Amino acid sequence: MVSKGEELFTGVVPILVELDGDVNGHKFSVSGEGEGDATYGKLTLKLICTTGKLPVPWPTLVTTLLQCFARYPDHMKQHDFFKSAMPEGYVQERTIFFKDDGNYKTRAEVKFEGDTLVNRIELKGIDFKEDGNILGHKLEYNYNSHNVYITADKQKNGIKANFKIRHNIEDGGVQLADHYQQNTPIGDGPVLLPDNHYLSYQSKLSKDPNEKRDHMVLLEFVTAAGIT
């Protein structure tokens, strides 16, 4: 295989996610577990709000709460930065602009801790309207399909990405969330720097019928594309 880190994703990998958030002073934490299967580009997570009631809609946290589980086609294997940075991992940082509303800033470390892939995140949100679509909880509990556009950032030995999420509004149009992303390796080992391509995402949100805590079950299907 074209990276040593790629070897770590040939089977099902257990996942842990931990997020600490503060949006307009409303603090919260989220803990999740699940598994990823990069051979099929699939991951499943159950995420719990461990502080009680989540003060923002679950859909607004989907992108923050594992691009190393993308399925890269065989002809694209030299473009998989994410797996090449494993097991030491990478930092993923974003600014997320909600149109006509506030923004999230996130910093995450995605790395192996033993045999488990862990995503540990800090999120800060500011400038939200208390009666906007986010703090007013006006978003549908569902998720559209999007492309994440990736380019190399050789100066940082990493990558950049951008994309636009469309969150359906209950009885309305959509709330846009414009994402800007950077990833840089944590380790010093060599990584794969890609040609321009994209990750095609499809996501499904659901609930565990036996779970009484505030939670989200998230299934993502992720496939790299955009190179002939």
Residue 205: CB minimum distance to Cl ion, A: 8
Interface characters, 163-202, with Cl ion (x: CB under 5 A): ----------------------------------------
Residue 214: CB minimum distance to Cl ion, A: 8
Please tell me the distance from the alpha carbon of residue 202 to that of residue 208, in angstroms, as a whole number.
20
Please tell me the distance from the alpha carbon of residue 150 to that of residue 131, in angstroms, as a whole number.
34
Stretch that binds Cl ion, among 13-21, 54-62, 166-174, 218-226 (CB under 5 A): 54-62
Q: Using the rule CB under 5 A, is 36 a contact of Cl ion?
A: no
Phi and psi for 70 in degrees, rounded to 5?
A: -60, 145
Residue 54: CB minimum distance to Cl ion, A: 7
Phi and psi for 193 in degrees, rounded to 5?
A: -105, 125
Residue 203 has which token pair? 């996501």
Residue 173: Cβ within 10 Å count: 9
Residue choice 57, 89, 185, 194 for contact with Cl ion (CB under 5 A): 57
Q: Using the rule CB under 5 A, is 89 a contact of Cl ion?
A: no
**Alpha helix stretches (DSSP H) within the chain:** 81-84
The residues binding Cl ion (CB under 5 A) are: 57-58
